[PDB]
């Protein structure tokens, strides 16, 4: 059984230090012989906003429209979007989501954000009950490869930023792991353009160097605990 | 003299519970004679993908296009989108921001991400000499007023999502007080959707109590150790 990844990748700029981590990871992905699959947002110009548009049939409650309820309830009776529908056909199929994204306000980039509040809708991803150990796209695992402008100095429980792991936990816990995702280890690859021209190759690299791999890790514990520590 | 007060708001509905607190905030401050002005990002139809139209113009570097470095020269040059300046404007002028939102995915909604990427640029709200408690936004407060899914419990140190500080930080300390911004205590309205039709008309009440007082307030130590901390 051959393996499946999707890449959902967020950067204007097909030369840009995150072009390149995406195109080493279609690489190196690609010679292993896996199916892989790139959302490039900027693009597809995704749509970000979650507005009422992204629903075809009758509203639940025409008078006042409720996103969560509105979207759960066109997932059901398959009446989302077929923008929404067609990133869930690729997720569905994936056995990996990898993130390509460089770090914005200590988060991702919108159009980013948007792929998560439209994609990840009720009935697909989570259900209540069904979320955090048993989300509904358990099974599957999450990295995130994130560049950032800040250095690993910088970004340190001392450091004016504070740790990398305290930005990680909207991310990895309370978006992924809530789907029933398990996370890998974050990719993180500190300030690029401040590095120079050869920490640069190395940084991307070593993300070819840790994709060739990627089949045998086991994912982060992720808790509380792993992001803050005590 | 005089207090200015910007809300930026993000939800889809007018009757909803979010925009309630934001019909009395603005009724509320407008009576203690404050000058206010409301941010409608859906009703704008906010654009929240961060591209090149958001410079007028030729760019600095067509070949390349950076984000970061055309946007802080475009500041400069004055050619930036006037969606942009027009928010920069309103930004400037105000002495308390208020940000009225949904919580999605322990993050704002992504048209309010946008606002954040698109509006917060180099050289308006922060430069390399300027961040922290050198942000170009300094002398202004600002309150994240957040509504939720989750349960009160659902977000103690031992609840599910853990506690409700730790999604803060992204915001308060990531993207406000890099700003320059001090941060009021955040104001978040746990499950109103569970909530009992009293308990909400409460929530309103104590939202707009706090309005009366908030020039009185002390501004939080906005620190990791009051993120993550006991
Ligand atoms: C709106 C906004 C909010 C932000 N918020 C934060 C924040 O909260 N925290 C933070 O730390 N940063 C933040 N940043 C900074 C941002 O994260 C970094 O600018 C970004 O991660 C760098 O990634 P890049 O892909 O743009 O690098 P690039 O801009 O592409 O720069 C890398 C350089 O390396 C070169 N290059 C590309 N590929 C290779 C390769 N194969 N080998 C050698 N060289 C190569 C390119 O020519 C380029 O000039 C923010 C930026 C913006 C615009
Ligand atoms: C994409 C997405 C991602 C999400 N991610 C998260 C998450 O990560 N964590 C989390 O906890 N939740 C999450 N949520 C849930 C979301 O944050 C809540 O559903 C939302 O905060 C409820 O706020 P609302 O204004 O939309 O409420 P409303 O649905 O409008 O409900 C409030 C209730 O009060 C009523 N009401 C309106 N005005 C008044 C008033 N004047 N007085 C009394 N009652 C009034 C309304 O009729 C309604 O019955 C997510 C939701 C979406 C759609
Ligand atoms: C360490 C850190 C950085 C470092 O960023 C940079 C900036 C420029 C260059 N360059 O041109 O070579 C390299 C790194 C940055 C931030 N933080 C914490 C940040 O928070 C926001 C940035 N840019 C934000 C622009 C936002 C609104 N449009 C940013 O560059
Ligand atoms: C505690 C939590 C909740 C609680 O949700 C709710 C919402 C409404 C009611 N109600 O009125 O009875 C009860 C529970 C929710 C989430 N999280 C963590 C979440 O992450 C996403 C939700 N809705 C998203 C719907 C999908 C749209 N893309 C959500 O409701
Ligand atoms: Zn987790
Ligand atoms: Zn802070």
């Not at 792929?115 to 990840?120: A, E, G, I, K, S």
Request: overall charge negative; some cysteine.
């Amino acid at each position: 059984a051959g393996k499946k990844v999707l890449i959902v990748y967020a950067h204007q700029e097909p030369k840009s230090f995150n072009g390149s981590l995406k195109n080493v990871a279609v690489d190196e992905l690609s010679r292993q012989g896996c199916t892989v699959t790139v959302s490039d947002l900027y693009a597809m110009n995704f749509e970000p906003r979650a507005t009422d548009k992204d629903i075809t049939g009758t509203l639940s409650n025409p008078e006042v429209f409720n996103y969560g309820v509105e979207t759960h309830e066109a997932y059901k009776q398959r009446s989302l979007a077929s923008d929404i529908t067609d990133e869930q056909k690729k997720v569905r199929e994936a056995d990996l989501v990898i993130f390509q994204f460089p770090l914005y306000w200590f988060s991702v980039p919108a159009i980013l954000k948007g792929w998560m509040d439209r994609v990840l809708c009720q009935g697909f991803a989570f259900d209540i009950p069904g979320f955090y150990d048993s989300g509904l796209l358990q099974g599957k695992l999450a990295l995130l490869s994130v560049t950032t402008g800040g250095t690993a100095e910088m970004y340190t429980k001392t450091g004016v930023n504070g740790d990398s792991r305290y930005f990680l936990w909207p991310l990895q816990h309370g978006t992924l792991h809530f789907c029933g995702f398990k996370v890998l280890a974050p990719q993180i690859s500190f300030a690029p353009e401040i590095a120079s021209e050869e920490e640069r190759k190395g940084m991307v690299a070593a993300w070819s160097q840790r994709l060739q791999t990627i089949w045998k890790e086991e994912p982060i514990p992720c808790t509380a605990h792993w992001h803050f520590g005590q």
